[PDB]
Design a protein around this ligand. Structure first.
Ligand SMILES: [Mg+2]
Lengths: 59, 51, 79, 258, 190, 107, 51, 245, 42, 158
RNA sequence: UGGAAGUCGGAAUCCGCUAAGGACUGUGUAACAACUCACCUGCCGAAUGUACUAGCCCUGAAAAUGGAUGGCGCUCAAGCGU
């Protein structure tokens, strides 16, 4: 499934319909569905970002 | 004054909807356009809700 | 381009004997090869070529068409 | 992008079901008077047939919906016709027998709940119970390595067979959607599958010009059926189980018997 | 094809005097004198009628026949120059740095001179010398407008084009930097 | 600056005062310019220019012919194969190439 | 091109975030306290990107 | 001639009419002739003529033709040998310039009263004499150009500024606004579009139309009508003085 | 005075006539008769 | 004492039409929720349909009326099952309308029509039905219009 | 569609009034507006338009010491066809 996901996404939504002068994309693709999930997602994302920064600084 | 095109109830409901995003942040509700309508001219129920 | 003020090396129009002989030989070989390809040509060719007809700007074209009608009527009457 | 409902006696359109943004590739009509449509706009819709209004809109698939199957298709195709081959005398008795067969085939936990499976070009399948789960799918059936062309419930309601473009036919549990076994004999994409009436065997018709009969309980190739000169497009197994019909690009019908 | 005869005509107003000798054309009006040498073009001049100049070409090709139209318009422009005159109005605009334009008349040469300063804050002084016979004035009716007038249309329009080309923005985005001096109106003095 | 700042600058201040006139005059000079390119460009640049002009002329002819004709699958497949990208699909036991050039051992 | 025209927002500095419904004066407030050229108009969604 | 202007092939829907339109006009006029008692000739000289749509709507029982003058003349017949009805060729002497035919069953005095009472203000075409001096004030240019007061007016749109400069107004863009001189009405005199008594040219009429200033009117002048019962042509006052051919 | 606008702004330019160097070789009536004869022949 | 006429597009049975109205009617002295109220009251007959609404404003209160349009009249005559517009999008008007209803719509739209007669008005309504995508008498509105022009179908006069 | 009125898109693309005018050719607006093109009328005035064919001319690729129609030079030829 991973080896075909990219061509699947391009066949579903071509590049010219996503961004550009003729783009028709209005709804984004989100990893969350509620505001509470968004708050938890932002917290976890900030924690992971700081962890990767600390790992890069240690390296 | 609701001249923005949306009801005060709708604005309050939007604030309550996005309130969980406001954790660990300071929140200030700014009543704009005071030259049109004042907070005292509002009905006491709406003043109570904003309180 | 700056051709007038700074011209480049001229392209000579004086031929060499070697190039003249080679061009003559290639032309003769091309003529022979074209004759062979025409002899083995598989493209369809008409038995009779399409006639252009009479030009429209010829002032007596209608009179010539009348003469053609009269000639074919006389031929049909004789036959 | 529409589905039209026709009255057969008059030939007139009663309802037009619209809302799909792509071609409607498959339609089924269930025993509780609900119409199920699958479409190239990647969605599966449930419509109320009496009112002609949308009931459910499932947008889980990531590509074209190719086929949809109902858990009650086998009894809904044959109505009151059964193994006994004596028909009831009156129309009320015939309708009662048809309804009884549908309810027996669609009963889950003592309640009538039709299950709907949808096969897609995103290599996956979805299992839906709109009566009990609403818009949440029962399961996503995963494991095919290419597009899923055709899908069918077994007549006893325990198994799901699906034919893929990865030259394979897969078997699934019809209650939780868990993969069971892979039927691996075809060398080209498998276009159609058909169940036997006793749910022991499934026949698959493929692009490699052959039919294959599979025993699903042993998971093995029971019979190999060569003879078609070109690709196989249509396969049916008769309800009494006596014959299998295949048709395709070689233009001649073939019937197969024991 | 060679055409046997081709002809154009030029009407001459009542207050104008036209003298043509060996294709050297002199036009006299209330506003002064203009001269133009047309001996690079094969043409026969004549007086067809009272107040009408005839131009003709004999045994000419299509190109030689077509050249008479240019000759006709050139002489008509000299006539219009000595009668009504020619006037080009230019407007200078800027965003931040005001353009300073100063106009002088050189007593030694008789020509006008235009000095342009502070063009997008530059420190250089741009100097353009007008063609002889072209007068430049800073307008009083409108803001930031120069008026170039004269009898010769070519001299006036070339002076305007020299002013236009001296104030050119270089190495900047011209969608953003809009400063310059542009021809805004063309017409007659009278 | 941020977002569409040149568009906002155009909205607030316009363009240069001679912009429309210069654009119209350049578009008017394109015919002479293209002929001058066709007669005066040299070498590989000339060859690529001529080939690309040939492509423009063919495309323009096709568009004009289609506009003239404005006022006027192949093999049967099942519905599940409809709208897919399908191939066009167009004793003496002789091979397609019965004879080729012989290769000597020296080569 | 869009990335080249994106505004530079430092996510770890002192920031005031002006939010709300359309047409309530958000861009008016931002114009009154900063030098940013964010347009003010009476119709909804005058501002379509972050400024 | 290798050097020639390249002809623009238009990729638009509507094609040129040709002789089919001429024959259709002939047949329409000759088929409307026997159904009506009177045929008037009217003239609308140097006018915009978009109010003929409203005239056609009001006279719904009548039939108006506003076509090519020579084609309408040939449709009626200009000689007694070619005339479609008795005495109809005497009407064709009015068919010069911009004219139209009006077939009616109404009493002619009703038509005359209608076109005497029809009054409509209109934008002037080039060649009309200006009735009044029009001057745009200095400062912010408004939509009406000073005809209505600026307090009740709205600023002119910023997309019209290059067109105003092309038509000769020395306007400029100041902060999204079109201004003549400065924003405070300084350093510039007002711009006079036209003076009273001056013959308008098309630049001046285009400026007047852009500022929505009407200096003319729409007026239909009846020249004369032919009657089917009598077979004769009655001349009217405008047709007494208009040139004939 | 001129009532119309010239597109390139050179308002002093005269009302030019069409460049027809073969103008005046045949009359209109003769060309009408030749049109009729050519159509009949075709 | 001046009268101001404002035209707008509204969906029937909705108060959101005043959302875009409130920027301009606010300075005019109107209460936007009040304007939304009488707009919804006037468009309650046209539920779920886009309609044209005229506001006549004098002395700081507005009178609300619905201006009939051919497309709204045809879609109303189609008698579609009620839908919620947020969940049921991309719909098609593929039902059928009788020719008598088409003629009734033409009589309703006669005040806007510039056609000389009712047959011309009916042909206009049939062209609008063709653009909407419906059927007339079970056939194509273009086919009915062609039959009317051929004289097979007779339209009553006035 | 947040907005989308011929002119970001998807699909249809008919009727009236017509002299003629696309369910629009471009510019333009957040959307409108405004402008423009197709098409039509008035003025004007006699010949034109398009596509091909044949000649001659230009381009249709060139390196590296300074040079070659044999050289001068030649242009209603001292070039090309008869
Ligand atoms: Mg706003």
């Amino acid at each position: 499934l991973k080896k075909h996901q990219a061509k699947m996404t391009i066949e579903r939504e071509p590049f010219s319909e996503t961004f550009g002068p003729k783009a028709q994309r209005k709804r984004p693709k989100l990893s969350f569905n509620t505001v509470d999930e968004l708050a938890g997602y932002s917290e976890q994302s900030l924690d992971s970002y700081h962890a990767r920064l600390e790992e890069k600084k240690l390296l | 004054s609701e001249q923005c095109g949306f009801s005060l109830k709708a604005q309050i409901n939007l604030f309550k909807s996005i309130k969980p995003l406001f954790a660990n942040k300071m929140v200030f509700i700014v009543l704009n356009k005071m030259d049109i309508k004042k907070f005292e001219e509002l009905d006491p129920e709406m003043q109570q809700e904003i309180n | 381009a700056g051709t007038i003020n700074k011209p480049k090396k001229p392209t000579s129009k004086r031929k060499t004997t070697r190039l003249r002989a080679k061009i003559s030989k290639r032309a003769a070989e091309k003529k022979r090869k074209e004759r062979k390809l025409a002899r083995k040509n598989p493209e369809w060719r008409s038995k009779l070529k399409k006639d252009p007809g009479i030009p429209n700007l010829f002032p007596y074209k209608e009179r010539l068409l009348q003469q053609i009608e009269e000639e074919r009527i006389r031929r049909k009457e004789e036959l | 992008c529409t589905v039209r409902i026709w009255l057969v006696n008059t030939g007139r359109t009663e309802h037009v079901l619209s809302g799909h943004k792509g071609s409607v590739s498959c339609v089924k009509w269930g025993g509780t008077d609900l119409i199920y449509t699958g479409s190239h706009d990647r969605s599966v819709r449930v419509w109320d047939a009496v009112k002609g209004t949308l009931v459910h809109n499932f947008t889980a698939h990531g590509h074209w919906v190719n086929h949809i199957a109902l858990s009650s298709d086998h009894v809904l195709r044959t109505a009151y016709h059964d193994h006994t081959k004596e028909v009831p005398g009156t129309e009320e008795e015939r309708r009662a027998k048809a309804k009884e067969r549908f309810e027996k085939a669609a009963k889950i936990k003592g309640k009538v709940a039709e299950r709907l499976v949808s096969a897609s070009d995103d290599f996956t399948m979805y299992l839906w119970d709109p009566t009990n789960n609403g818009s949440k799918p029962v399961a996503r059936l995963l494991g095919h390595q290419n597009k899923v062309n055709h899908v069918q419930f077994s007549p006893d309601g325990t198994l799901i067979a699906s034919a893929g473009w990865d030259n394979s036919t897969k078997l699934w549990n019809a209650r939780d959607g868990k993969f069971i076994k892979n039927l691996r004999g075809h060398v080209a994409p498998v276009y159609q599958c058909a169940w036997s009436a006793d749910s022991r065997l499934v026949v698959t018709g493929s692009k490699d010009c052959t039919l294959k009969v599979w025993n699903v309980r042993t998971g093995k190739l029971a019979m190999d059926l060569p003879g078609h000169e070109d690709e196989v497009y249509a396969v049916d197994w008769a309800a009494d189980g006596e014959l299998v019909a295949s048709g395709g690009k070689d233009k001649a019908v073939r019937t197969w018997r024991n | 094809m060679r055409y046997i005869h081709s002809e154009e005509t030029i009407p001459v107003p009542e207050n104008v005097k036209v003298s043509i000798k060996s294709r050297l054309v002199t036009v006299e009006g209330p506003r002064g004198k203009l001269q133009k040498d047309l001996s690079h073009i094969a043409v026969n001049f004549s007086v067809v009628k009272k107040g009408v100049i005839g131009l003709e070409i004999h045994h000419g090709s299509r190109k030689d026949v077509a050249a008479l139209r240019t000759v006709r318009t050139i002489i008509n422009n000299m006539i219009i120059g000595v009668t009504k005159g020619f006037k080009y109005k230019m407007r200078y605009v800027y965003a931040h740095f005001p353009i300073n334009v100063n106009v002088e008349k050189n007593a030694e040469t008789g020509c006008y001179e235009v000095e342009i300063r502070n063009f997008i804050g530059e420190k250089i002084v741009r100097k353009v010398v007008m063609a002889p016979g072209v007068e430049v004035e800073i307008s009083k009716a409108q803001k930031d407008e120069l008026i170039l007038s004269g009898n010769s249309l070519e001299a006036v329009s070339q002076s305007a084009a020299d002013i236009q080309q001296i104030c050119k923005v270089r190495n900047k985005d011209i969608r953003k930097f809009l400063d310059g001096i542009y021809v805004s109106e063309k017409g007659n003095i009278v | 600056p941020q977002n569409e700042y040149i568009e906002r600058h155009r909205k607030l201040h316009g363009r240069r005062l001679d912009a429309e006139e210069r654009a119209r005059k350049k578009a008017a000079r394109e015919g002479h310019k293209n002929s001058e390119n066709a007669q005066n460009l040299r070498g590989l640049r000339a060859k690529l220019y001529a080939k690309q002009r040939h492509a423009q002329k063919i495309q323009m002819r096709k568009a004009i012919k289609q506009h003239e004709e404005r006022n006027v699958p192949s093999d049967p497949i099942p519905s599940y194969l409809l709208d897919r990208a399908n191939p066009t699909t167009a004793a003496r036991f002789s091979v397609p190439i019965p004879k080729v050039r012989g290769i000597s051992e020296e080569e | 091109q869009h990335l080249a025209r994106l505004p530079d927002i430092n996510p770890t500095t002192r920031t005031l975030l002006v939010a709300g419904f359309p047409n309530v004066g958000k861009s008016s407030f931002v114009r009154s306290v900063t030098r940013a050229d964010t347009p003010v108009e009476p119709y909804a969604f005058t501002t379509k990107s972050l400024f | 001639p290798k050097s020639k202007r390249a002809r623009v092939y238009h990729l638009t829907q509507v094609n040129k009419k040709g002789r089919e339109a001429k024959e259709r006009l002939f047949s329409n006029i000759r088929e409307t002739i026997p159904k009506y008692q009177h045929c008037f000739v009217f003239s609308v000289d140097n006018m915009r003529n978009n109010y003929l749509k409203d005239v056609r709507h009001e006279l719904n029982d009548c039939r108006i033709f506003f076509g090519k003058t020579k084609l309408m003349a040939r449709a009626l017949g200009t000689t007694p040998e070619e005339e479609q009805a008795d005495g109809l060729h005497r009407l064709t002497r009015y068919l010069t310039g911009t004219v139209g035919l009006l077939f009616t069953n109404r009493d002619p005095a009703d038509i005359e009263s209608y076109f005497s009472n029809l009054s409509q203000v209109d934008f002037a075409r080039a060649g009309t004499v200006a009735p009044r001096t029009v001057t745009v004030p200095p400062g912010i240019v408004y939509s009406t150009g000073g005809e209505v007061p600026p307090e009740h007016d709205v600023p002119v749109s910023h997309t019209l500024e290059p067109e105003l400069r092309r038509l000769g107004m020395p306007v400029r863009m100041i902060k999204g606004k079109v201004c003549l001189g400065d924003e405070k009405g300084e350093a510039s005199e007002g711009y006079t579009i036209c003076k009273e008594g001056e013959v308008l040219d098309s630049r001046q009429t285009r400026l007047l139309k852009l500022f929505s200033i009407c200096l003319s009117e729409f007026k239909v002048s009846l020249l004369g009508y032919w009657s089917s019962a009598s077979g004769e042509v009655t001349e009217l006052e405008a047709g007494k003085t208009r040139p004939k051919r | 005075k001129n009532l119309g606008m010239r597109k390139n702004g050179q308002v002093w330019l005269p009302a030019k006539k069409a460049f027809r160097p073969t103008k005046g070789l045949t009359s209109w009536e003769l060309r009408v008769k030749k049109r009729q004869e050519q159509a009949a022949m075709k | 004492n001046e009268i101001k006429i404002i035209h707008l597009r509204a969906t029937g049975g909705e108060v959101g039409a005043s959302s875009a109205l409130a920027p301009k009617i606010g300075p005019l002295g109107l209460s936007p929720k009040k304007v939304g109220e009488d707009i919804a009251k006037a468009t309650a007959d046209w539920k779920g349909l886009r309609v044209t609404v005229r506001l006549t404003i004098q002395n700081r209160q507005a009178q609300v009326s619905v201006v009939p349009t051919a497309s709204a009249l045809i879609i109303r005559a189609l008698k579609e099952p009620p839908r919620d517009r947020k969940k049921e999008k991309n719909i098609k008007h593929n039902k059928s309308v009788s020719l008598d209803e088409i003629i009734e719509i033409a009589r309703t739209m006669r005040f806007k029509s510039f056609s000389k007669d009712l047959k011309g008005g009916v042909k206009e309504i049939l062209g609008t039905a063709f653009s909407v995508g419906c059927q007339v008498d079970g056939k194509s509105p273009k086919a009915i219009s062609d039959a009317i022009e051929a004289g097979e179908i007779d339209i009553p006069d006035e």
